[PDB]
Amino acid sequence: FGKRKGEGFGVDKREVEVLRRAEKLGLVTPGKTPEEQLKELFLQGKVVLYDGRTGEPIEGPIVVGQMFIMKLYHMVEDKMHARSTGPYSLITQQPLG
Amino acid sequence: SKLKAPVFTVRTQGREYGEFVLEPLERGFGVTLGNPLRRILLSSIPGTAVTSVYIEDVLHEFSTIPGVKEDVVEIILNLKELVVRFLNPSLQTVTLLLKAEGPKEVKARDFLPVADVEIMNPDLHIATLEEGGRLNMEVRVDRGVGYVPAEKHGIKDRINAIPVDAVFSPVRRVAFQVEDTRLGQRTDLDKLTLRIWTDGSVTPLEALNQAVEILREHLTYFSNPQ
Amino acid sequence: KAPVFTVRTQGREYGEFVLEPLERGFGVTLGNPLRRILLSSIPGTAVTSVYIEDVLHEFSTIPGVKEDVVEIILNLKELVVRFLNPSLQTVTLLLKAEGPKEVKARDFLPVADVEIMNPDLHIATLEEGGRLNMEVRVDRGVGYVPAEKHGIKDRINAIPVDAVFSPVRRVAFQVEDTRLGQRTDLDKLTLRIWTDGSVTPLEALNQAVEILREHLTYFSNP
Amino acid sequence: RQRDIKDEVWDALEEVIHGKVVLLNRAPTLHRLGIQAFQPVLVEGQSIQLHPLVCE
Amino acid sequence: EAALRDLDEEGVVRIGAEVKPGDILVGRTSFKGESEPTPEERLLRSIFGEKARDVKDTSLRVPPGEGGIVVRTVRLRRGDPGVELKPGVREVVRVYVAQKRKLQVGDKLANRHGNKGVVAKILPVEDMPHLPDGTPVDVILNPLGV
Amino acid sequence: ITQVRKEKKGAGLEFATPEEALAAHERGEVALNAPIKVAGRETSVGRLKYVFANPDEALLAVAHGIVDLQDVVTVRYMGKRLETSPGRILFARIVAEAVEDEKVAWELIQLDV
Amino acid sequence: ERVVRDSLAALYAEEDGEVAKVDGNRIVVRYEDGRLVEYPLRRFYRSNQGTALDQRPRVVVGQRVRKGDLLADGPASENGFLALGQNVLVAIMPFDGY
Amino acid sequence: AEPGIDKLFGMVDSKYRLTVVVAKRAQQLLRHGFKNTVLEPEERPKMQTLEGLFDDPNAVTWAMKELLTGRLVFGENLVPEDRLQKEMERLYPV
DNA sequence: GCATCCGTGAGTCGAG
Ligand SMILES: [Mg+2]
């Protein structure tokens, strides 16, 4: 937030609405300043988040952060399969597996 | 009661960044104008990207060059970061040549200079070379839109050319602030600020203008009912 | 290619508008702004304030009339008024009647260039000896302004009314995926608009798109 | 040959499956609702799309 | 020639070649068995004047849904230095094919806490929820999982 | 969307006149959704302050942020004057439009929960 | 880190020394002993599961390295730390049922 | 759901009888090339192509649509199989 | 009438 303040920007109109709903949720202390409240939410790991489709915010403050995530060995590329007709089995004449 | 055309302010730092203010605007127009532009900016703004690469003595991306520290994979990954501006708008394709060797750290500035082509980040590290290490390549650069994966375009100038993923969009980031404003009689007016970062190939401003043109052009499509 | 605009209409009060194909994402890019605009900046007429002779406030109950003041002001909110004079910014409508009669919007004294779209709108039921004398202010405005926000009074004992300006009663939009040849990512925009009849869904839309286009010209000169 | 496949092929395939349904099955098939019929919608990509309401 | 294009002189696909389903990796001919040409085969063969070849096509092709760039070949023949193949085996060829796999729908992701899930939708950056400074999120995890 | 707010600022104060209640609210004495007694009966500031002719108006109000979907209010629907949230109205509408039968739709839903 | 260590994936320096050569294919190091050791790097080698095992040089020519210093990274390690996934910016919220 | 499914179930004493009737009818349509249909030109099930709207190829869709009209008669022992097949081959040759 | 022996069972699909 500090950088933002220095860059010459104040609380966005939307951050105010989210802060409203927030103090309605008992998340921030009423009467405290917008910056103080946004910080109060940040300490809870929540941030004001903007829906990229609308531009409107998410009604509540939301948990955002860095998570470590792995791509596991199971990929559709390996697993996707289909068959019309194909190899049958010696004795049973039923399709192979 | 009817509002009148707002003041349009422009604050620029070089070709990289811009801030664009519009005030005042009727309540709600902060995002009504802000968002569709952000979307268009992030998506539909034409730029330039490296489409293909040809390394002398390299058959495919999974190769490795003697004398060079970087595998062809990492090299391509670096060329992916090359931002090249075309001065002449009639020009839709370029081929940069780079021939280097000996104990040097190659950068984007080591490309043989071409007319009407400016490398916005000549400081960009490309490959680290060693004694006897020779790196000689031809990298093709195209103008295009959005994100087109190597698999899609499959662009090869020659037999051993390696198609590269093209992130065309010159726009790195877009934000917009909507702040409170008044004309004293009216409260709840909102001022809009579009903060726009770029690679430098096009300019936050140029970007913006292209975005608006795209949007209005789209509004045109509502012309002929049926 | 050039997207194809398509229209389905029911009277003057409802419309569906389809635009396809659009590049990926553009469905909501167009859809959202137009909706915000269509719900706020479309020019219409509302009832801003009301004075009832004997009545002193909103929650008072009229003797000889069934519906309490509140119900009455609500019915008023439902009054659809059309200014034929492009320059007309407001009007006062007077209505007086009595005895065993049910008062309808047509009983408002004819005024200047003014259309009452819903003449059959019920206002109040009056019994024997029941008297109704009232003046209601109709203003040209946009969007929705709660009573306490405009706070207009012609005279004392007038009660201010929540102002439903927007002739657009509802807007819904839906974007769904569309295939054009090899392209499966395309956007198809469906836009549904409900109007009170004063403007037309198509009219409303065009006014909206226009507002937007004009707003796009603001990025002209620093 | 996968490279020999034109787009009119796909368009034809869209014509082929029209109106038709296919069976989806997940194991264990505990009750008869472990198999259900759906009219398929051809999609790019390699995974099958399943309706949220039938997951249960 | 379209089918044989990327095959070197010996019949093995050339290093660097991009191969897709159906493509030939290593060409191979087998000797046709005891042949019972059907009367139809005889009338047909007669109509075109061509002769039925001695050898069937048994070449190794890329299986359905597989493929990539040819990064390696190995070739071992009977009676060349240092190599001996199981009895009866004349030669053995190995083709190593590589692929650079991007993340896609159906692929599986997890974290170290047991949260695992398949990728259901890849959203264009402008639809991604984002911070006031315009930085979009990378991943969206449903809280109902916790 | 179908849940309703319960705020404690009001804390069950009693009033003779609704106007008193509203002024109090605007002073920040009483919260919008608080259970309060006016005249005799138990009511809320929002229901009095906001009385909507039709659901379309309630929702137009929500659109403009005059109220939230979970604020309790007064809406006139199908001839009756209801005390509910715009949200619950919206739900009833969803069902209604979905089954293209409004009267049945109204029967099925439990609106008060 | 110790995991990348005990499983031989990353390549390390035997004794205090100085990097002589650095290539995509190999790393040559001159130690205190004066002896010149050459370390070949495994490059794009396939594994039982088909995942690529390759090492990449993590040092530069003329660099001073102590005994036990990292000369190369295994598959899935970053500067000698085990790297199984990526760090992404994540938001915990429902999203349109996707 | 299938259009008018509830009505279709309404028409029969057993859902499986519905299924049989529909399947058989579809077989008839296929066999005689749809030219035996009880649907009029404006009721003909349609299909979207690049070219335009063409007859829906799907005979079961047709069959159910026809069933909705009531133009079709079903039951057991209506007519000997010989007579049926042959009269249909006379009325709509293949 | 109870002890005790033998014989027969003990999820599905997938990959491999
Ligand atoms: Mg009020």
Curated annotation (Swiss-Prot), chain C:
Q: Reaction catalysed?
A: RNA(n) + a ribonucleoside 5'-triphosphate = RNA(n+1) + diphosphate
Keywords, comma-separated and alphabetical:
DNA-directed RNA polymerase, Nucleotidyltransferase, Transcription, Transferase
What are the recorded GO MF terms, alphabetically? DNA binding; DNA-directed RNA polymerase activity; protein dimerization activity
Q: One GO term of the cellular component aspect? A: cytoplasm
Domain of life, per lineage: Bacteria
Q: Which GO terms describe its biological process?
A: DNA-templated transcription
Write the Enzyme Commission number(s) for this entry.
2.7.7.6
Q: Where is this region: Alpha N-terminal domain (alpha-NTD)?
A: 1-222
Q: Assembly and interactions?
A: Homodimer. The RNAP catalytic core consists of 2 alpha, 1 beta, 1 beta' and 1 omega subunit. When a sigma factor is associated with the core the holoenzyme is formed, which can initiate transcription.
Its biological purpose is as follows: DNA-dependent RNA polymerase catalyzes the transcription of DNA into RNA using the four ribonucleoside triphosphates as substrates.
Q: What is known of its domains?
A: The N-terminal domain is essential for RNAP assembly and basal transcription, whereas the C-terminal domain is involved in interaction with transcriptional regulators and with upstream promoter elements.
Query: Into which family does the record put it?
Result: Belongs to the RNA polymerase alpha chain family.
The molecule here is called DNA-directed RNA polymerase subunit alpha
**Organism of provenance:** Thermus thermophilus (strain ATCC 27634 / DSM 579 / HB8)
Segment of the intact protein contained: 7 to 228 of 315
Swiss-Prot record, chain D:
Report which superkingdom the organism of origin falls in: Bacteria
What this protein is reported to do is described as: DNA-dependent RNA polymerase catalyzes the transcription of DNA into RNA using the four ribonucleoside triphosphates as substrates.
Q: How does it assemble?
A: The RNAP catalytic core consists of 2 alpha, 1 beta, 1 beta' and 1 omega subunit. When a sigma factor is associated with the core the holoenzyme is formed, which can initiate transcription.
The record's family statement is: Belongs to the RNA polymerase beta' chain family.
Q: What is this protein called?
A: DNA-directed RNA polymerase subunit beta'
Which gene name belongs to this protein? rpoC
UniProtKB/Swiss-Prot annotation, chain E:
What does the UniProt function comment say about this protein? DNA-dependent RNA polymerase catalyzes the transcription of DNA into RNA using the four ribonucleoside triphosphates as substrates.
Protein name (database record) = DNA-directed RNA polymerase subunit beta
Q: Which residues of the full protein are shown?
A: 731 to 876 of 1119
Q: What is the lineage of its organism?
A: Bacteria, Thermotogati, Deinococcota, Deinococci, Thermales
User: What family does the Swiss-Prot or TrEMBL record give for this protein?
Assistant: Belongs to the RNA polymerase beta chain family.
Which top-rank group of organisms is this from?
Bacteria
Gene name, Swiss-Prot/TrEMBL: rpoB
Subunit description: The RNAP catalytic core consists of 2 alpha, 1 beta, 1 beta' and 1 omega subunit. When a sigma factor is associated with the core the holoenzyme is formed, which can initiate transcription.
Swiss-Prot record, chain H:
Q: What is this enzyme's catalytic activity, as reactions?
A: RNA(n) + a ribonucleoside 5'-triphosphate = RNA(n+1) + diphosphate
Q: Please give the biological process terms from Gene Ontology that the record holds.
A: DNA-templated transcription
Q: Where are the transmembrane segments?
A: none
EC number(s) stated in the UniProt entry for this protein: 2.7.7.6
**Which terms does the record give in the GO molecular function aspect?**
DNA binding; DNA-directed RNA polymerase activity
Q: Which domain of life is it from?
A: Bacteria
Q: Would I find Transcription among this entry's keywords? A: yes
Q: Does the keyword Plastid apply?
A: no
Question: Enzyme class, one word?
Answer: transferase
What GO CC terms are in its UniProt record? DNA-directed RNA polymerase complex
Sorted alphabetically, which keywords does the UniProt record give? DNA-directed RNA polymerase, Nucleotidyltransferase, Transcription, Transferase
The record's section on InterPro entries has: DNA-dir_RNA_pol_omega, Pol_omega/Rpo6/RPB6, RPB6/omega-like_sf
Q: Which Pfam families would you find in this protein's record?
A: RNA_pol_Rpb6
Q: What does this protein do?
A: Promotes RNA polymerase assembly. Latches the N- and C-terminal regions of the beta' subunit thereby facilitating its interaction with the beta and alpha subunits.
Q: Which NCBIfam families match?
A: rpoZ
Q: How does it assemble?
A: The RNAP catalytic core consists of 2 alpha, 1 beta, 1 beta' and 1 omega subunit. When a sigma factor is associated with the core the holoenzyme is formed, which can initiate transcription.
- Name the family: Belongs to the RNA polymerase subunit omega family.
Identify this protein by name.
Answer: DNA-directed RNA polymerase subunit omega
Native species of this protein?
A: Thermus thermophilus (strain ATCC 27634 / DSM 579 / HB8)
The primary gene name is rpoZ
